[PDB]
Ligand binder design. Structure first.
Ligand SMILES: *[C@@H]1O[C@H](CO)[C@@H](O)[C@H](O)[C@H]1NC(C)=O
Ligand SMILES: *[C@@H]1O[C@H](CO)[C@@H](O)[C@H](O)[C@H]1NC(C)=O
Ligand SMILES: *[C@@H]1O[C@H](CO)[C@@H](O)[C@H](O)[C@H]1NC(C)=O
Ligand SMILES: *[C@@H]1O[C@H](CO)[C@@H](O)[C@H](O)[C@H]1NC(C)=O
Ligand SMILES: [Cl-]
Ligand SMILES: [Cl-]
Ligand SMILES: [Cl-]
Ligand SMILES: [Cl-]
Ligand SMILES: [Cl-]
Ligand SMILES: [Cl-]
Ligand SMILES: [Cl-]
Ligand SMILES: [Cl-]
Ligand SMILES: [Cl-]
Ligand SMILES: [Cl-]
Ligand SMILES: [Cl-]
Ligand SMILES: [Cl-]
Ligand SMILES: [Cl-]
Ligand SMILES: [Cl-]
Lengths: 532, 532
């Protein structure tokens, strides 16, 4: 039967799902690891033990335990990102959308959700892979991984809570795809991993980690890079936060053994309730439990690996959105509100700068302030607001990604860069937030093709073009079709550094994405902070 | 007789000079101090001993001993600034142009020549005061003062070479004007001192020095301020340079007495021949012997005086030119040449930055480089050239003047600011140099009114408007005529900070002159250099 597939782990029975007046096969909630529960909390994942009989893969799995956004109850803009399934530590499953009839050996794309490593679900409506699988005829997989303390609590030296286990969850899912996707009609030698935000940083981390490189062919990074300031911490800082978490839960801190034992006795929500109390600074765009530079998953520092070419050399497609920082300013910076234009005073601008670059000394803060202040009109509330927005986006996403692309391209086999600046016509968030962190995803997954979602004809066209760019890149390593009549997305080279905008207007090629600000963030500021 | 005037120092006989189809009286070469020769070299000036008989004031006096520019022999652009009279240490004289018939009690303007404190003459054709005196009907005086080691060698603690004697020369001339100008028809209570470059810095220094304040009514500063980085040195640095000068002349350095004795035995040219060898850094826009912050002429640091309002409170009119730095880049920066467009490579740009900000550490140099580099087009030779030009002008003239104007205006009684950006139609210097340091002077002195000089009709008009602004300001403290129909030059205020451009186009009012760069030079960079 088309819905019955026999894998090395056992048989699975999918379900026939409708999609754009047609149908495709969906295998939802396939386990790829043993439930990381009980004494398995914080520990590396273990392969799922093969099962007898048929596994019912007709419904989505549970979502991993995580902090839930309740800042705007009843508001779809925020709630569309929250878990839409019941949360459980038993959450290591993957979903597969397969074209009908079942392909023989077709391109595979594996989605890695974002969420700052503290949240995320593979089951969100915005991640429904049926449109992309159907339209581009690819086998689309979405995996899952532990987030928060459950996936990243790090007490280096310990084998019970070594850190990075969420990344190992991702790897195990990729391993399962490598070992079994052939049975679903997918080609294991042509797998493209793609993800947004923390998912994009993760994709980059697998490109770097020797233990992950052999599990995929090429990669796509959306609004995230392995070197982002929020994407990793040192083993020392990771240890400090784990201890502080224990301190928040009245744990015995005499030893790792005692600490871990205590943390394992706590209910999931107990850890989540104090998770944000372990941050070292009053900040925004900084998350508690994230990957740790351990000397194992990451042999050496990310920068030395990038400089020495110690990473998988293949083709990559990546990019950023126009206003990556607006979301986090709304949630944690003074002067910003969801229902106002959020014009910011010079006072709130300064406060915002300090929250955005928490690790900087006063000289560093002065440098940032001067770099983003128009002294001919310093009390302009709109300029102050947009300036802070740019600071947050440049520092946390754009400039780190630009540093990554330039370093990677020196050793890589092909780079394609984009700048997504289309503000959706049906966005529920205020206009001041612009092109928000994560809002290119709906276009990548083809939501604009669904009439009921209220997108414009132009937006359906943009989505189809994006899905085709992504799928063609996954299939060939080039988003452009051979001998096509359409505008060509040029290769990003060390010399010309070209990129294209992604919007409803005719294609435009540019060079040196935000180079002026990124020289500040990537070269000058770090030098200043190190000298002072 | 109209040409005979009896002063407190004795009688003087002037000469009738032609000017624009008319005539005026000129009293040239009037001594105001005893010749600072022999054992009087380096020492404070002494009042000129009254003389019997009639002093012949029909011809210009000698020019003070100074370095002579021989970089472009036969070229008027450079030679017009060199001494046009024989050089001698016996050079403390002043010149007076008086309207005919002799006024009774009219506005007086006293010119203080510039030249980086290492050069300058009151006798240059460009300083001929007959046009201004005639046209605006003011008594115009041009004084002189010792420059170079002769006027600024400083061995603090010694009374034989205390430093600042060139400034004391200026003061003595102002004292003479205060005591005698009434006999020439000038009003001693309505004297305006004005000067360019080092002359502008000097005007500001007299505003600051308690010993000079009572000698004038108001002031005009052109392309120079007391706080310019090249305008003064500490007593320690002044002492170091005096000793180094002696070292260059094989002097006994065992004591100030021995050093001074040796220096006094040397011929003038011997000192001049090694004057430039005492600079501490490889630099441009830095001169060897300049005013010293002695605790006498200047009670405390210039900045503390400015902050505390420890200065003469009156009205001031001041401004700068568009390209103040081009001249010094031509003479000392790599890549610049008089007969080429001087497009500069990134390499020469970096070298130029280091020469322009000699006191900065590498971090500081990086800060300047980033502030003036367009990273979207960093190899643009024209942008690099103009960028360096701006760095030199901003750092050495504009930003220091802007810091002065903002500090002064808080306590002053009226500030008028200008930005001179007119490139003369008959300029002999290359186009790349733009509106050069010192080239607004010819307009202030009315040279464009002389048909034979080849200026345009528009330039004659601009000159007349400038001369009238200057003279009206000197007369009333406001460059605008009461109940006039012409555009009004607004008062510069702490809040609106308005200024006007000075060119052949209709008046335009602007605000916050080069505020973005000046915040960098006046606030950020100093903080960076002090923290590192
Ligand atoms: C799970 O599999 C069973 C078959 O045993 C099927 O009837 C059911 O619809 C599947 N999912 C649900 C709705 O529980
Ligand atoms: C990618 O590698 C192949 C050889 O494996 C080479 O022919 C090709 O030029 C490379 N492409 C780029 C853009 O580096
Ligand atoms: C100096 O004064 C004398 C009068 O004794 C006069 O003849 C002469 O022209 C003046 N200047 C010159 C030309 O030496
Ligand atoms: C200057 O001072 C006088 C009082 O002496 C005052 O009336 C006038 O307002 C002041 N002008 C400015 C611009 O400060
Ligand atoms: Cl549908
Ligand atoms: Cl411990
Ligand atoms: Cl805190
Ligand atoms: Cl916050
Ligand atoms: Cl970069
Ligand atoms: Cl929306
Ligand atoms: Cl809205
Ligand atoms: Cl004439
Ligand atoms: Cl000595
Ligand atoms: Cl040197
Ligand atoms: Cl030089
Ligand atoms: Cl300023
Ligand atoms: Cl000229
Ligand atoms: Cl020319």
């Amino acid at each position: 039967s088309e819905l019955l597939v026999n894998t090395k782990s056992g048989k699975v029975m999918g379900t026939r799902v409708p999609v754009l007046s047609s149908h495709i096969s969906a295998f939802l909630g396939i386990p790829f690891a043993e439930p990381p529960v009980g004494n398995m909390r914080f520990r590396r994942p273990e392969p799922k033990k093969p099962w007898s009989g048929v596994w019912n893969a007709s419904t989505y799995p549970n979502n991993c335990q995580q902090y839930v956004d309740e800042q705007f109850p009843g508001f779809s803009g925020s709630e569309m990102w929250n878990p839409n399934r019941e949360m459980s530590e038993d959450c290591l499953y993957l979903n597969i959308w397969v074209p009908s009839p079942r392909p023989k050996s077709t391109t595979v794309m594996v989605w890695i959700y974002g969420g700052g490593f503290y949240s995320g679900s593979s089951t969100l409506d915005v991640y429904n892979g049926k449109y992309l699988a159907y339209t581009e005829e690819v086998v689309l997989v979405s995996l899952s991984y532990r987030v928060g303390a459950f996936g990243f609590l790090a007490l280096h030296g310990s084998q019970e809570a070594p850190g990075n286990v969420g990344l190992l969850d991702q790897r195990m899912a990729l391993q399962w795809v490598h070992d079994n996707i052939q049975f679903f009609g997918g080609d294991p030698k042509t797998v493209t991993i793609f993800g947004e935000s923390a998912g994009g940083a993760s994709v980059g981390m697998h490109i770097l980690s020797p233990g992950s490189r052999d599990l995929f062919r090429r990669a796509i990074l959306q609004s995230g890079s392995p070197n982002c300031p929020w994407a990793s911490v040192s083993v020392a800082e990771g240890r400090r936060r784990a201890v502080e978490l224990g301190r928040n839960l009245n744990c015995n801190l005499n030893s790792d053994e005692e600490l871990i034992h205590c943390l394992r006795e706590k209910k999931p929500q107990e850890l989540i309730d104090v998770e944000w109390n372990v941050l070292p600074f009053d900040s925004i765009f900084r998350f508690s439990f994230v990957p740790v530079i351990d000397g194992e998953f990451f042999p050496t520092s990310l920068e030395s690996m990038l400089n020495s070419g110690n990473f998988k050399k293949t083709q990559i497609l990546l990019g950023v959105n126009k206003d990556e920082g607006s979301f986090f300013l709304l949630y944690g910076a003074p002067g910003f509100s969801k229902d106002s234009e959020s014009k910011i005073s010079r006072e709130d601008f300064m406060s915002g700068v300090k929250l955005s670059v928490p690790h900087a000394n006063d000289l560093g803060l002065d440098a940032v302030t001067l770099q983003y202040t128009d002294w001919m009109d310093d009390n302009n509330g709109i300029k102050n607001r947009d300036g802070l927005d740019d600071i947050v986006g440049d520092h946390n996403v754009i400039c780190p990604l630009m540093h990554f692309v330039n370093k990677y391209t020196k050793f890589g086999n092909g780079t394609y860069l984009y700048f997504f600046n289309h503000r959706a016509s049906n966005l529920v968030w205020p206009e001041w937030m612009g092109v928000i962190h994560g809002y290119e995803i709906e276009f990548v997954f083809g939501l604009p093709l669904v009439k009921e979602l209220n997108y414009t004809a132009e937006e359906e066209a943009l989505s189809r073009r994006i899905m085709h760019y992504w799928a063609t890149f996954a299939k060939t390593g080039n988003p452009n079709e051979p001998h096509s009549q359409e505008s060509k997305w040029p290769l990003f080279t060390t010399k010309e550094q070209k990129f294209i905008d992604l919007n409803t207007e005719p294609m435009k090629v540019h060079q040196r994405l935000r180079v002026q600000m990124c020289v500040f963030w990537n070269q000058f500021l770090p030098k200043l902070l190190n000298a002072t």
